[PDB]
Design a protein around this ligand. Structure first.
Ligand code: TPP
Ligand code: TPP
Ligand code: CL
Ligand code: CL
Ligand code: CL
Ligand code: CL
Ligand code: CL
Ligand code: CL
Ligand code: K
Ligand code: K
Ligand code: K
Ligand code: K
Ligand code: MN
Ligand code: MN
Lengths: 336, 371, 371, 336
């Protein structure tokens, strides 16, 4: 396994990431009578178990299967949301979100703007499994966030843990804008952590500094946060380097201020993501940090990303931007 | 006896392909002939005189507005225009069969639905001019109308995208226990899009109270229907989805009305979709046919025709002139409503623009825009 | 008489919605009963003994391979697997009706087509293991088979994407004046995708020699067909597109063969699409039914059954063991074929990896990979 | 009008950009008997006249209308190309390419890779009108190249003129990879220039330095090249600043070397595009130039792009990254 997962709101219980999604969804349906959940195979509990029990508890009219048609799932969800009802759509793998790209980019994202706020689909949330899983190859591994980051009017949100997933998913569901929430599927059954039973919110468009540091800033999201945490430990032990480790959380709109403040302090930035380098979201972060922090930069901003290929099957261990790749880039940057 | 969960059927012991019936298609429902006479008394809707006159006047007012705005576009005074010629009857006839609060989705040929619902000439014009009165804030090209008050969802250019959306809205209406229908208008070209298959199928499996209203005028831009499909139009697709379907004469406001009224009644009661395919011409016109009906009842005459022609031209010209001399909205409105709130980085772009205009403002049309 | 270019039809003077006929659907064509007896002599294909035995042995070899690879997946030795249980007859029966050079598009249930076309056990295994023998270079998950030599287009995971592609290939074949068909396999779930509507409609308007072969086994993962569609399966959709359609018993290799053979003959001659919907079970099995046929002709017996069961298990196990002990391809193959050529910036990434492995190579499974 | 268009291969004649497309297409069909052209309304000559006369010359089986279905148009084109025949698909406005996004990104781009080169769709080209047009609003104005730039396996190519369009389109049609060729529609009927009658090629993945300069590097593509040419003139006249003006031409794979060599010389870069800033292709260029030229940079790299909104109707003159916006950013960068 290429990562290690590790670590005020009332009663908690141990939940893995799929359970924390179910808990979010359960709290949502309990408190919002308009809310419905739909998509492929959601009725029996979903292929990743994220909707287990929900149909029995809330009814077949609120937790239901659609035909096998992603453009339809998103269009249908928009339409629910146009009426003001909360629509929680599922796309079975993020890899299969593309048929709905037109409905997401040309419709959902532009609905409010183009109507002068006469109509909206703010009560729509699209959730989908994301990211590499060790053997998923081209169509069970993808990280599509950079495609969506170039579209004004949607929000794109990615958690790193069960506690983060529930609070961020609740925030997406309640946010008054169409949100895509990408669930790192390699984490669904990884380690549990304590998660509040009752609803709570984690703010959108806010990065989280999970470890303070003074020599270099490391930025990632999803599973890759755990990789950069381990990189921070390697750099401390092997190089005496102090790393400030930041989880971006929200891809758009992103927390420019938190990232720039960190880099003003450290003077060095390394951004990492599983998505391919070219056109990846690391380019937006690097460009922006260079614009705001030019005089503070002691070394070129590093991007350690997936290669510019489709996501391979048997070659996955060589493809991913692992801790050794991140560490080596960090080493060279420090020695610049 | 077959035991297959995918279908309900007998065995057959000989090989026979099922043929399409395209030469003898689904027949075209008509109520009045070309001289405006009711063909079959049992099919008379007996709409009251004041409603039928409202049908006529809505259609003719639309036609007057089209003439003026078409010319405005030819002169470059507005940047784009789509007329309603040939579609006046499908739109007013169907709109008249809806409850005022039934939600409408459509695209470019649906202005008559708004006209029937008394949308002000001033607001049709405000959208086309992108002026300060436009509740769309001048952001979309012309004829991209919408009205929250009149339950008419804002038009968008990508064809057929409204179809699965309309189905979602109908599903929500079902749950809310509404006594409400959704109607979704689209052309025969748009029906080729994948989103049409999505919408039709979702509406059937999810048991939604929606009327699909397909306008078939034989063309999509330059493309005749021989290059668009090979079955018996769009009406013949409905049964394959489990959708109750009918074909109607789109030049007959009463045929359109009757089909829409019955579709509405059954959709709302049964929570099941209906498909109406109205056959029209690309432009034996709906306005003329209804006019002959009016004359036959003693409900109109040449003097009334002349006077209304004059009054409608004056009403449209007054709205037109007012619309042209209004300013455009504040340029600040280029940044609002992208999200509900304005993100800080977007506000930063707005501030960049304001600074830029302080310095370079003489190079921009600031005098045409509000504040 | 109506004068509408969109459709060919009479007028009707009464309002009547057209109902779907779902309870009395399109009947299911069958040639042999469950005891393997030909029901209607006129429908006997009289396939020669050696071809029918090849049908049987292809199906059973597939079933043997499935048992072994299913277990391999359960043990985590391969990462993914899709079986063919219940689909052995649809695939071998249809493949046997094609010319060897007819191009096949499909997805996950089509391994039998490759087996009929003599694809080596070694290459089925090489793809599933991603080993050095895999002409796919280990890049796709397991069961994503393809073979240029045997005119079987490489499978991809996104459902229904192959449908409009298959139509394009058929259009090209038409132009090349080929005496070639394209066949395109997909499930009933996949038929819900927008790409299915695209493919069906393009094939009809553009007059393509293609056979659409829909496998209807009543489920798409957990979704029963009651949540997938509401018309009379997928066969009932064909006529709405102007496509000649038939439904067949997928547990009857001869019914499948006969429908496919006739569809092929007419498609190639007439340049028109055909739709075959084969009803199967999610797993009165195709292998058993054909076995009863064989016994009735004196073409097989228990001794032959036992011996072939043993020989096929040995052949599969030999291929399996060989496949497991081959190395995986050179990691350099992660970078080729993204484009035809390798762009310089991609070569730079490849060089980065080689440098990285020189230093950090002990942390990677280098010993499992070639060179 | 927001721009001004201005300015060895045998006989030439004056052609506008639509004519130069028709000439490319004509040469292609003449010399490649497999080649076909298809899409919405192409038979009568197309809505922008790019296929006038071609059906009469080459036959109804080679220049033909499809049903109104963009996912079908691309899927169909892939399928033609799988057989080795040249397939030249048209998408009527780039704004309507999104329904085909799944077919482009998950299928076309990955076809060769995922089959180990057993199959490909290299003989596919997708051409589509692109870019702002003064009044096109949300769906007749878009510049989608950054969405496609994050997808390994496709090429994205955008010309600035009729001469450039014909040579680049011929190169796309003959290139052994699926190409998207975006035609700046505001140029279709703008000024003519001399275009060779006979076929010729302009190389893909090669930027063109159209004016040498020593103080700053300006990069754009499409119509925006003409804007930056005018900016160069303004900077010379008003500031005594010498600008090196570069047309990128190919978005992916892009000519990193040409851009970096220029910036090593000048030490300053400004990139401009009509597409929204966030996730726009300027971020990839800026990030990369910062990585390769860090020590040569005298000032932060500037991006002058469309705002992060949908493309507005009445506000277009305020939205676009015009010569005054580019000039002002250039002024501040020079004064840094
Ligand atoms: C997705 C998409 N593709 C193409 C277009 C361009 N387009 C605008 S109208 C039209 C023809 C529509 O025909 P139909 O649906 O029959 O309606 P009609 O114009 O005949 O009323 C086309 C292709 C568009 N708006 N959207
Ligand atoms: C576009 C897309 N969405 C979802 C999936 C996940 N998926 C893999 S198989 C399957 C069910 C397919 O059912 P059907 O087409 O009936 O074929 P069957 O498995 O019954 O043979 C699904 C939803 C996918 N591969 N592609
Ligand atoms: Cl006039
Ligand atoms: Cl349009
Ligand atoms: Cl000026
Ligand atoms: Cl076993
Ligand atoms: Cl899958
Ligand atoms: Cl290790
Ligand atoms: K939301
Ligand atoms: K629309
Ligand atoms: K596929
Ligand atoms: K090409
Ligand atoms: Mn039409
Ligand atoms: Mn199935």
């Amino acid at each position: 396994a290429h990562f290690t997962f590790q670590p005020e709101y009332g009663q908690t219980q141990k939940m893995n990431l799929f359970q924390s999604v179910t808990s979010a969804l359960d709290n949502s349906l309990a408190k919002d009578p308009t809310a419905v959940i739909f998509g492929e195979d959601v009725a029996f509990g979903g292929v990743f178990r994220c909707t287990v029990g929900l149909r029995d508890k809330y009814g077949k009219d609120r937790v239901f299967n659609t035909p096998l048609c992603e453009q339809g799932i998103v269009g249908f969800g928009i339409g629910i949301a146009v009426t003001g009802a909360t629509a929680i759509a599922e796309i079975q793998f993020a890899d299969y979100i593309f048929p709905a790209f037109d409905q997401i980019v040309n419709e959902a994202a532009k609905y409010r703007y183009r109507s002068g706020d006469l109509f909206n689909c703010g009560s729509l949330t699209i959730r989908s499994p994301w990211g590499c899983v060790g053997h998923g190859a081209l169509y069970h591994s993808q990280s599509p966030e950079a495609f969506f980051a170039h579209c004004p009017g949607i929000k794109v949100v990615i958690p790193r843990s069960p506690f983060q997933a529930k609070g961020l998913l609740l925030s997406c569901i309640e946010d008054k804008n169409p949100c895509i929430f990408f669930e790192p599927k390699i984490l669904y059954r990884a380690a549990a952590e304590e998660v509040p039973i009752e609803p709570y919110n984690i703010p959108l468009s806010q990065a989280e500094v999970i470890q303070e540091g003074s020599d270099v800033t490391l930025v990632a999201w999803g599973t890759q946060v755990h990789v950069i945490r381990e990189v921070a430990s390697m750099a401390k032990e092997k190089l005496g380097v102090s790393c400030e480790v930041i989880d971006l959380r929200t891809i758009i709109p992103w927390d420019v201020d938190t990232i720039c403040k960190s880099v003003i302090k450290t003077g060095r930035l390394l951004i990492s993501h599983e998505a391919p380098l070219t056109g990846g979201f690391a380019s937006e972060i690097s460009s922006t940090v260079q614009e705001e922090c030019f005089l503070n930069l002691e070394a070129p901003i590093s991007r350690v990303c997936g290669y510019d290929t489709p996501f391979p099957h048997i070659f996955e261990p060589f493809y991913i931007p692992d801790k050794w790749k991140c560490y080596d880039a960090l080493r060279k940057m420090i020695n610049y | 006896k077959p035991q297959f969960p995918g279908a309900s059927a007998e065995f057959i012991d000989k090989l026979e392909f099922i043929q399409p019936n395209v030469i003898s298609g689904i027949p075209i429902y008509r109520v009045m002939d070309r001289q405006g006479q009711i063909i079959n008394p049992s099919e008379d809707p007996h709409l009251p005189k004041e409603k039928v006159l409202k049908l006529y006047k809505s259609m003719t007012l639309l036609n007057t507005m089209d003439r003026i705005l078409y010319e405005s576009q030819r002169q470059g005074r507005i940047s784009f225009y789509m007329t309603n010629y040939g579609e006046e009857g499908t739109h007013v006839g169907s709109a008249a069969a809806l409850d005022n609060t039934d939600l409408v989705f459509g695209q470019y040929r649906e202005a008559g639905v708004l006209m029937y619902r008394d949308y002000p000439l001033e607001l049709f014009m405000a959208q086309c001019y992108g002026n300060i009165s436009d509740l769309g804030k001048g952001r979309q090209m012309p004829v991209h109308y919408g009205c929250k008050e009149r339950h008419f969802v804002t038009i968008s250019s990508p064809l057929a995208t409204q179809i699965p959306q309309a189905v979602g809205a109908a599903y929500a209406a079902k749950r809310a226990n509404a006594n409400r229908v959704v109607i979704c208008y689209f052309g025969e070209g748009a029906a080729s899009e994948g989103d049409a298959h999505a919408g039709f199928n979702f509406a059937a499996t999810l048991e939604c109270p929606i009327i699909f209203f397909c306008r078939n005028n034989g063309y999509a831009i330059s493309t005749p229907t021989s290059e668009q499909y090979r079955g018996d139009g769009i009406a013949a697709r409905g049964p394959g989805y489990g959708i109750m379907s009918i074909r109607v004469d789109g030049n007959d406001v009463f045929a359109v009305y009757n089909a829409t009224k019955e579709a509405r009644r059954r959709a709302v009661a049964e929570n099941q979709p209906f498909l109406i395919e109205a056959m029209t011409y690309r432009i034996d016109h709906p306005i003329s046919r209804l006019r002959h009906y009016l004359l036959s009842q003693g409900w109109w005459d040449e003097e009334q025709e002349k006077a209304w022609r004059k009054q409608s031209r004056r009403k449209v010209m007054e709205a037109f002139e007012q619309a042209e001399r209004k300013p455009k909205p504040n340029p600040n409105l280029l940044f609002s409503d992208v999200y509900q709130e304005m993100p800080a980085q977007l506000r930063k772009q707005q501030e960049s623009l304001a600074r830029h205009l302080q310095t370079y403002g003489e190079h921009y049309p600031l005098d045409h825009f509000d504040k």
